[PDB]
Amino acid sequence: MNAKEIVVHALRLLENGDARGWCDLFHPEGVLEYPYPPPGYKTRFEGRETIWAHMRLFPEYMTIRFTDVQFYETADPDLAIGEFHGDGVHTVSGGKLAADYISVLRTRDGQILLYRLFFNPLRVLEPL
Numbered sequence: 001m002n003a004k005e006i007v008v009h010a011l012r013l014l015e016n017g018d019a020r021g022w023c024d025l026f027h028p029e030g031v032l033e034y035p036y037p038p039p040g041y042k043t044r045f046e047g048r049e050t051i052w053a054h055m056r057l058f059p060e061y062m063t064i065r066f067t068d069v070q071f072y073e074t075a076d077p078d079l080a081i082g083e084f085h086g087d088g089v090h091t092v093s094g095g096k097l098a099a100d101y102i103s104v105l106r107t108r109d110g111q112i113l114l115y116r117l118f119f120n121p122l123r124v125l126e127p128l
């Protein structure tokens with residue numbers, strides 16, 4: 001798949017609570033980044049296993065759906081840059097996360113080398 005197809009397939013996996021499948025999309029040496037992380041969190045997760053250690057916990061703590069996926073037109077199909085919106089619900093709290101993302105994804109042969117995901121960490125600290 002090209003980068004834009006991988007992005008949309010990745011969002012679909014997360015919406016279904018399938019964090020294992022989402023991590024499976026990364027290259028073994030692939031990198032997840034949160035350039036604007038919530039206080040305390042790392043900004044960079046290197047390697048598929050390190051990413052999985054982090055993401056495996058998500059499905060139990062939160063449910064999410066995405067909307068408004070829009071891509072800017074790049075030159076190379078293995079790069080996608082898109083904005084979208086996520087609406088998460090904390091399972092225990094009932095608290096809600098409403099986030100506008102911008103993402104940069106670099107792919108190589110159907111696997112993710114870089115998934116750079118900008119969001120406003122203030123939306124995380126202020127559930128609704």
Ligand SMILES: C[C@]12CC[C@H](O)C[C@H]1CC[C@@H]1[C@@H]2C[C@@H](O)[C@]2(C)[C@@H](C3=CC(=O)OC3)CC[C@]12O
Pocket residue numbers: 011014038041058064086099117119124
């Ligand atoms: C930073 C974050 C904040 C909510 C909660 O504390 C869990 C952490 C780790 C997990 C993290 C959320 C923020 C969320 O917006 C994420 C970035 C969200 C993602 C959206 C995305 O495309 O991939 C990941 C799913 C869950 C998420 O990966």
